[PDB]
Amino acid sequence: EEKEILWNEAKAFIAACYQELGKAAEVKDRLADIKSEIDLTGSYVHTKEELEHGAKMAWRNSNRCIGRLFWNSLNVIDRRDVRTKEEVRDALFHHIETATNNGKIRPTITIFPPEEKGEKQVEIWNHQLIRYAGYESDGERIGDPASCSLTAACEELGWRGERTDFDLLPLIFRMKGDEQPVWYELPRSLVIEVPITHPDIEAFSDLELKWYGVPIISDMKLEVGGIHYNAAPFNGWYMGTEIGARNLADEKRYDKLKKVASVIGIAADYNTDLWKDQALVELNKAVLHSYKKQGVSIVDHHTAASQFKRFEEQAEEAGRKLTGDWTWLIPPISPAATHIFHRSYDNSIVKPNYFYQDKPYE
Amino acid sequence: EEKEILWNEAKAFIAACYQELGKAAEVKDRLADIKSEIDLTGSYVHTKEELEHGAKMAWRNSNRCIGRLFWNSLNVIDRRDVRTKEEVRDALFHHIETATNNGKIRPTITIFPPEEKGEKQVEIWNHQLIRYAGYESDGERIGDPASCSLTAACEELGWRGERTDFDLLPLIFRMKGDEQPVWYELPRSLVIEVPITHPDIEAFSDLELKWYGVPIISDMKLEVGGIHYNAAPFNGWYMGTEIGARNLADEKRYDKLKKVASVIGIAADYNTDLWKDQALVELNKAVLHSYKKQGVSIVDHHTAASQFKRFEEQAEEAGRKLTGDWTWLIPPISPAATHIFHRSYDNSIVKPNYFYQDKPYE
Ligand code: HEM
Ligand code: HEM
Ligand SMILES: CNCCN(C)c1cccc(CCc2cc(C)cc(N)n2)c1
Ligand SMILES: CNCCN(C)c1cccc(CCc2cc(C)cc(N)n2)c1
Ligand SMILES: C[C@H](O)[C@H](O)[C@H]1CNc2nc(N)[nH]c(=O)c2N1
Ligand SMILES: C[C@H](O)[C@H](O)[C@H]1CNc2nc(N)[nH]c(=O)c2N1
Ligand SMILES: [Cl-]
Ligand SMILES: [Cl-]
């Protein structure tokens, strides 16, 4: 049944890929080649062109992503050649460096060797390459609660965090044939961070808030034509609300709204004062202003939505069906001020795509 | 097929209704009574108890409603006795008066005679009993664009609006056996309106914004045990965002955000200033403050969400399945600050319920 799923997905992908690349004539011969290769080997190997466009298609098909207008400019790094943990480590370091690009962020994906018999060659434990640790000791909460389980797992393995609110987790990944993952401390010179200040409220710095420049999702599986690239970290730049309305705002994340309200000089006593809404807006203005002042790429939700509208138009013009997840596409602040809120989207799953996979910790 | 649908819905409703009312023993005899009555007459007549609880159940099952915690205190007015347009008119006037209750708003439904052969006895044209007219003449826009078609239909029938931005539409409804609807101007003494001022920004009054006190939906069909009450207007009190984030804010409604930005003294030039978000918050604070200052009931979205959480808990405790429409339940500002945003809801349709029906204009 497995070779049949593989052959079916391969047929669907190669036809669509080569059609998009103006290479429809080469489909019959390549499919034959793949057909023999699956028979003989149990799998097949993508060409560099196929892998690159496949990763691009996968981004284009990501229903929950508002940033898809730029799917075709994704920078794809082919690291199917890696065999050692030093090489994985250095590829991860390189990804951070090149994607960060001194603040002028480049959407980038690094692709590691894929699963064979469903056997992972490389298994990345981080949720993002750059993320903050989280601790809970006797009701004492430090750092990012969403990182609590991974942080605990790292500390099993001999890492120890300084227990600041912004400890950088180390990189942590397991190689095929190893029972335990290894971990490496991130070089601080690789990691851009942005202190959060407000454009007119000087007291905002008293909060001592900061966030990292580049969100690099590293625990999703990329699927292209039946090949499972379980290890394929990717990044864009942030939309400001991700940091301002969620990471810093959620009660189960950093939970900063009461402290924001205090420094901006409003009471946090009555629901009818809409103090949470006012604090959300100021904190979100602060995030945007801070990233821009530092020369680190970021987009606001209004501009992002305008871009997504162009993606929608672009899709219809190319004759492609559009898919989307309305519940993830709407921004978590002023969603009704975007066009997204006022239409609906087909949430069908089209491949290639990025998919969740099980945590090896927890 | 129709008598079978009716008998099936009747069986489902009577069992559930009498079960809730502790009257399970009376189910067999009442079902027999209904069974004979459908056979003989082609329909059946609800008891006052059945109608009241049915309307309450219908509210409880309304997936899109955040205000359902108070389903059981709905004030049900039985007007199945009306036969003339004067009686319909006076029942509508009375509904406005009693629901308004000097500002201390009572959730109320008035139930008119139901469809017979799918033949309406009374057909209400208004979307809400109290709503503002809308005009578009040569790119000139006045009033509420959502009312444009109904306004045009009224003006066919000899009504003429003053072409203020806040003309009250007249009541308009058609009686069975009449080819045209009649219309009646609303007595201003029946209609509470609230001028929009801001708690600290005195200039906000320069916008000359106002809204009506009581939203009375009058174009939905109430369905109870197979009986179609196509004419059954109902009301609650407003959640502030309905007015502040939608009615006054949407580009295709009153579109006031640029003018809000100006009076609150911020520029409306750059998306990264989040001026739309800041204006939304201030306008929404203004709406809440204005209703409260006048003694007209209203709820903010935070309190409403807290109440809805109690509805959820209340449902589980009573052993009832909960249904909801996540996309309508989340408020259009700071949705991620409510618990609603962070869970999911089963959007199944359970009856009794309120349903859309076709506009007789358009
Ligand atoms: C270029 C800048 C980008 C922006 C501004 C952007 C924006 C977003 C946002 C706001 C989300 C919602 C995430 C959340 O609420 O947690 C998202 C989800 C997502 N984005 Fe993008 N994105 C960008 C680039 C990319 C790239 C380069 C990829 C992959 C090649 C990608 C794939 C995804 C996926 C898979 C999700 C859903 C993840 C999940 O289900 O948890 N995006 N994007
Ligand atoms: C008591 C105060 C109430 C509040 C604060 C409230 C709140 C809301 C809100 C905010 C909506 C969304 C509407 C929109 O965005 O256009 C809504 C929808 C709805 N509410 Fe309520 N509601 C209340 C009372 C009632 C009552 C008394 C009924 C009926 C007996 C009702 C039935 C509904 C229905 C049917 C909808 C959906 C209408 C549609 O699909 O267009 N609600 N409610
Ligand atoms: C509710 N828990 C959500 C955790 N998940 C699944 C999650 C957490 C953080 C971030 C994401 C995707 C965010 C993202 C990814 C990329 C490439 C760019 C961007 N701007 N945001 C997803
Ligand atoms: C997108 N067009 C939406 C028009 N609809 C369907 C609409 C328009 C206005 C109002 C509603 C329901 C609003 C409502 C009803 C009641 C009883 C109370 C309340 N607070 N809100 C629904
Ligand atoms: C098509 C889309 O779902 C539509 O804009 C919905 C979104 N959720 C909503 N929610 C509420 N409360 N009111 C609305 O009118 C809408 N519109
Ligand atoms: C269960 C519920 O759908 C969940 O809270 C979703 C809502 N939409 C979202 N949208 C974004 N962008 N990010 C999220 O984490 C979520 N969470
Ligand atoms: Cl993030
Ligand atoms: Cl309304």
Curated annotation (Swiss-Prot), chains A, B:
Entry's Gene Ontology BP terms: nitric oxide biosynthetic process
EC nos: 1.14.14.47
Disulphide bridges: none
Residues binding heme: 65
Transmembrane segments: none
Keywords assigned by UniProt, alphabetized: Heme, Iron, Metal-binding, Oxidoreductase
CDD domains in UniProt: NOS_oxygenase_prok
Record's function text: Catalyzes the production of nitric oxide.
Record text on subunit structure and interactions: Homodimer.
Protein name: Nitric oxide synthase oxygenase
